[PDB]
Amino acid sequence: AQIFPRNANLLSRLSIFALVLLVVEGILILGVYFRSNYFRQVNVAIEQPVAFSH
Amino acid sequence: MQPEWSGDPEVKPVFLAVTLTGMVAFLLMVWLFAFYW
């Protein structure tokens, strides 16, 4: 209470928890983007110069 | 010696929240890294 306010305990516990969760979320971001259908161009009908129809 | 949070009412739902964190985050890495391709 000399330096910090009353909810410093609240903010510090939430900050350590949030740091763990953003590490987990950044790993989830990297994994999702490297497996994404945008990255590997999966289920994307890539346009050909004639538009052949199979 | 016991911890200073041993006789606190927060010790039940916070330590339930650590395992509910574990079974959400770790199972999310399980879903992404094994069942998502």
């Binding site: 609240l10 516990r13 939430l14 928890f17 949030a18 969760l21 987990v24 979320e25 989830l28 971001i29 999702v32 983007y33 497996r35 994404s36 259908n37 945008y38 | 927060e10 739902p13 916070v14 339930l16 929240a17 509910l20 964190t21 959400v24 985050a25 999310l28 879903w31 992404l32 998502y36």
Partner: peptide, 25 residues
């Protein structure tokens, strides 16, 4: 707090599940 743990993890769950859906967008 513990209800803050639940709320933060539910926000992380919703945002992460939206991200997982966006990887199959």
């Amino acid at each position: 707090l513990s209800r803050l743990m639940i709320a933060g993890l539910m926000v992380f769950l919703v945002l992460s599940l939206v991200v997982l859906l966006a990887g199959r967008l």
